[PDB]
Design a protein around this nucleic acid. Structure first.
Lengths: 158, 206, 263, 37
RNA sequence: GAAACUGCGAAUGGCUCAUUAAAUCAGUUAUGGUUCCUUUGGUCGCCUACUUGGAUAACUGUGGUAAUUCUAGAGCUAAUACAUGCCGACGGCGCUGACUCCCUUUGUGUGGGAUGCGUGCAUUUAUCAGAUCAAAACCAACCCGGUCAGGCGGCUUUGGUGACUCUAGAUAACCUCGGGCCGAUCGCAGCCCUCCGUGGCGGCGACGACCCAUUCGAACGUCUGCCCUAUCAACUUUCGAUGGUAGUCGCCGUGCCUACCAUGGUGACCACGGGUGACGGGGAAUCAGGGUUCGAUUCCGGAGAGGGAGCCUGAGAAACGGCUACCACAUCCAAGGAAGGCAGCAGGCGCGCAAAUUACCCACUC
RNA sequence: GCUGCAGUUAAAAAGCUCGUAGUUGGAUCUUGGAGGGUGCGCCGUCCCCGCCCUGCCUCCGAAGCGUUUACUUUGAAAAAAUUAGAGUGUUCAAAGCAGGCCCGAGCCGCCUGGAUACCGCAGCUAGGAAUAAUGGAAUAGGACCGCGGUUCUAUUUUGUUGG
């Protein structure tokens, strides 16, 4: 959790209003914050964390004001140095006829990562989706965390 | 002049982008209104695609709405108290979106007393006897007491807002973009936001 | 370039299906702004002097038009480069001819005379269906005609019989498995046929498996499919050929057999 | 003219209910049969 | 009907390839991130109304300047230029209401009112709305329908897209104001009046406007593909380098910019740096097959008009057959001044291995 | 010199080994009978196909929906010019996109045209399931209202509305 609100500006979802009010129990009222969410589409389940969560993230595909349209890509997570954003490495095959073997090649792609996803840990394969320019670098948003404790080289548990 | 284009600076690779074409009007951009509080002045600006955008420089009244009330009143904007972006904005008393201002309350008070007939805070007897009392006294027998009776329950109003009423100045957050729109509008703070700003207002103050 | 709208067309960079020659000049007509997209249109000038042979010059095409001789969908059009298109009518009166612009199996606007009725109505494919201003709803057809208050069944991709004097939809056809179809673009441009299947993709791109009256099957993008009535029952004239499509060998077999003997 | 179109359109949508309304009924009644068991 | 004013074009075309090496660009995608003239489709009732104010050109006349696409001064004076502002009306409907009846002291329940006084859209803000599902026992209130012996039951509603804070509706205002909109045109030629002079009506033929969509587009965003080089191996930020967060700015996305706050982002899968007989592609040439090389150049996309930078207008231009400064060049002069940009068509100099008429026409193609 | 080079002595295997990147990687997990194309004079010859001597589940469609891919296969999307390449009497041809007829003109006229193909990749579709990788349960886990105690949330419905 950690107090979100943290900054100096009051974090809130736009046009989702309040009004607490008098009388007893709650008190005001118990949830104290109406929350608005939506499913991205493309059959990406909007994870519970999004609905359950307090966090604000405009950039979030479920909780925020961003639409996912365009290319849907998958990549492996190389970095999770930056707050709320990750870098994924995309391997692809380059074909060279002139004589014919193509050589592995890669590209790194910066992509925003909603706090709804966690355990975003380097090594994880992830499915990101195209989006409106979030930041000068970031074109994408993490839609699904593919996972696996597998890759055994260790034993994951639950 | 000013040039939204990235095509200066450096990419992510870090390589020196080489100059392609000049600075192009399509990329065009501008100086800020830096709108300031006081007797109204506005200027028209030519924007892309025809279309005219108001640049407000100096504003004294805005249209601020009391959300929980569901009512909006036009008041003088007294001053700038808090600004997340930059402090100068506050000290200079410059108007921008997200700026936290103090409006004036009197229009809100006049409406509230009239509609609920319970007067805010615990002001005074002499005041009641004077004007606003006349409204309170009202009557029609009849006319209005029945309405006042119907109301009650809400009418609690929230401690933080009422306390502010005593001052005669209410905290509000500028919703609109004065430099763009030419209107300095906003909503009275409240609930949680009001709690956060009060914490900021006292905390930093001293 | 780079400050404004192009006003010229280098001929050669014009759409093939007008079948303008290579020599002649540098520039093709270039369709005015109008009810049909520039690629997908047939500037009257090409119709009057390139298909119908009424005109020789472009100077003549103009002289014809200023008479008022020619109406498109009923309402005299006086521009040389007016962008007429699919489902348009075109009526030259003091000559008594009604023509409907609808495709070859080549994919070429065909010279297709229609009766003095029929000329009354055209079939438009719904492009969007809209709640406009004040709460009114509207449909938008391919040919850029907006009709308010349509009946609530009508949904994007359905087609719609427009009156024509009056505007006014005077019924409709749903897009459902088994409807007759006209192909309005792409490799299969001009083929007519029933349906069979719409394969659906979220994100983007829906394909329509079509089967012709010869059990010939093919796909195109949903964008390219136009509904024109009920199997064996088109709601308009079809051009000779019933948009069939025949192999270059079949095509040769017909060409030599029908003549140098066979009347 | 616009008023006539709006009024006529409402009739078709409102009148359609009669024929469509029956459709729903063929569900409510059955909703009891399945629950029976 | 010379002209002038007005409106529109002049942002297109034509020309060259210098700059420029993931830049440009090609194929693919996209705008749910936005602007869009025009066409096309829609949208237009609330006591000067039978219609408001007053001035500039063309013109006349008088001139100035060595020389000017210079222009003064004055006297007029046109408008679909300019600044205004209305007949139109129509209301029941909202809040207020002299009040009054019935079943019950006070009250409580059920009721209904003569007369007063925000309502067209646009924009901005705030709020609501934008309805998804199956059954029962009791208590407090009260609607109808069939009733006698307090006693039996029961119903009505919300547009679309895979996903929007989408469209649309309701409430409170706001003004972006004089500075949103709702319109202050022509030339040629028989009607009728619950009734008498009026007001209502009739032929031929001569652009604006608000808002929405459309069309031609535009501006950005996706990937995937580029020459040589390591005698270029670490690079990028205190003059933002990568990210958070909020604002200002822009047509709009975005470190665009700025504050604060993090310390990032990239590299042997060649980054960074440098070079270049590099504009990029469709294409071209050489033909076993594989390949090998070129592409400035009749099309597409991009770029520039002596070099650099800035700007006005307008929907669209960072325009040079616009302007403006400097910088480099050149020209006229009565020496104070003043006027200019052939990588447009011809032509000419210089350059070189190398490249045409100082010609005719808008008839074709547009 | 991919296809398709040479390196003992001709120009050319580092003095030798370790070694990261890169490249490269063992075996092993499903087993005649007729339909349609073109030759030869009612007969047959020679391909191609489902067969004989293999998506689950949800509970025909729909939907659930994919273990990841690469690959390959079938579609769409794929500028014109160009190029390969059909139809076409520029007299021939390069070209060009025409033309050829009915007709002796009273025909107050007919009509065929101006194909198609290629189009890298990447992306989009789709079928295959070999090949190459890839998925887990052995410090036990997944399945099936197998069953329960604990707690939460959403709206049908006791006419209506509140507890």
């Amino acid at each position: 959790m950690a107090d979100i609100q943290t900054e100096r500006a009051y974090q809130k979802q736009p046009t989702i209003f309040q009004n607490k009010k008098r009388v007893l129990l709650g008190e005001t009222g118990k949830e104290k914050l109406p929350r608005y969410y939506k499913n991205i589409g493309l059959g990406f389940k909007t994870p519970k964390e999004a609905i359950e969560g307090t966090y604000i993230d405009k950039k979030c595909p479920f909780t925020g004001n961003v639409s996912i349209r365009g290319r849907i890509l998958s990549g492996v997570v190389t970095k999770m140095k930056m707050q709320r954003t990750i870098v994924i490495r995309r391997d692809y095959l380059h074909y060279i006829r002139k004589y014919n073997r193509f050589e592995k090649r890669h590209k790194n792609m910066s992509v925003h990562l909603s706090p709804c996803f966690r355990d975003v840990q380097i090594g994880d394969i992830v499915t990101v989706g195209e989006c409106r320019p979030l930041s000068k670098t970031v074109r994408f948003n993490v839609l699904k965390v593919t996972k696996a404790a597998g890759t055994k080289k260790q034993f994951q548990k639950f | 002049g000013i040039s939204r284009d990235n095509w200066h600076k450096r990419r992510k690779t870090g390589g020196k982008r080489k100059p392609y074409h000049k600075k192009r009007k399509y990329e065009l951009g501008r100086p800020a209104a830096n709108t300031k509080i006081g007797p109204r002045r506005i200027h028209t600006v030519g924007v892309r695609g025809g279309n005219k955008k108001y640049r407000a420089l100096r504003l004294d009244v805005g249209n601020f709405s009391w959300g929980s009330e569901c009512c909006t009143r036009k008041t003088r904007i007294i001053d700038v108290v808090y600004n997340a972006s930059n402090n100068e904005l506050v000290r200079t008393k410059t108007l921008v979106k997200n700026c936290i201002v103090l409006i004036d309350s009197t229009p809100y008070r006049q409406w509230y007393e009239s509609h609920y007939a319970l007067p805010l805070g615990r002001k005074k007897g002499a005041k009641l006897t004077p004007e606003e009392e006349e409204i309170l006294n009202k009557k029609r027998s009849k006319k209005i007491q029945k309405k006042y009776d119907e109301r009650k329950k809400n009418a609690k109003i929230s401690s933080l807002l009422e306390e502010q009423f005593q001052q005669g100045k209410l905290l509000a957050c500028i919703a609109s973009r004065p430099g763009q729109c030419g209107r300095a509008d906003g909503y009275v703070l409240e609930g949680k936001e009001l709690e956060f700003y009060l914490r900021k207002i006292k905390a930093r103050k001293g | 370039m780079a400050r404004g709208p192009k006003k010229h067309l280098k001929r050669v960079a014009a759409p093939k299906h007008w079948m303008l020659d290579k020599l002649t000049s540098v520039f093709a007509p270039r369709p005015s702004t109008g009810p049909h997209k520039l690629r997908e249109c047939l500037p009257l000038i090409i119709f009057l002097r390139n298909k119908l042979k009424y005109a020789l010059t472009g100077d003549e095409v103009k002289k014809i038009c200023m008479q008022r001789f020619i109406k498109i969908d009923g309402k005299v059009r006086a521009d040389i480069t007016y962008p007429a298109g699919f489902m348009d009518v075109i009526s030259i009166d003091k000559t008594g001819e009604n023509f409907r612009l609808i495709y070859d199996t080549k994919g070429r606007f065909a010279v297709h005379r229609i009766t003095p009725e029929e000329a009354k109505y055209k079939l438009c494919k719904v492009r969007k269906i809209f709640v406009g201003t004040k709460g009114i709803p509207h449909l938008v057809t391919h040919d850029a005609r907006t009709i308010r208050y349509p009946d609530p069944l009508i949904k994007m991709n359905d087609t719609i019989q427009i009156d024509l004097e009056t505007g006014k939809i005077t019924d409709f056809i749903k897009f459902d498995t088994g409807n007759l179809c006209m192909v309005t673009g792409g490799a299969n441009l001009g083929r007519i046929g029933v349906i069979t299947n719409r394969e659906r993709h979220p994100g983007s791109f829906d394909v329509v498996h079509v089967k012709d009256a010869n059990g010939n099957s093919f796909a195109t993008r949903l964008s390219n499919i136009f509904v024109i009535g009920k199997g064996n029952k088109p709601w308009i004239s079809l051009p000779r050929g019933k948009g069939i499509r025949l192999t270059i060998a079949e095509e040769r077999d017909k060409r030599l057999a029908a003549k140098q003997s066979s009347g | 003219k616009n008023k006539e179109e709006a009024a006529e359109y409402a009739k078709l949508l409102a009148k359609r209910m009669k024929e469509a309304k029956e459709k729903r009924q063929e569900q409510i009644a059955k909703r009891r049969r399945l629950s029976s068991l």
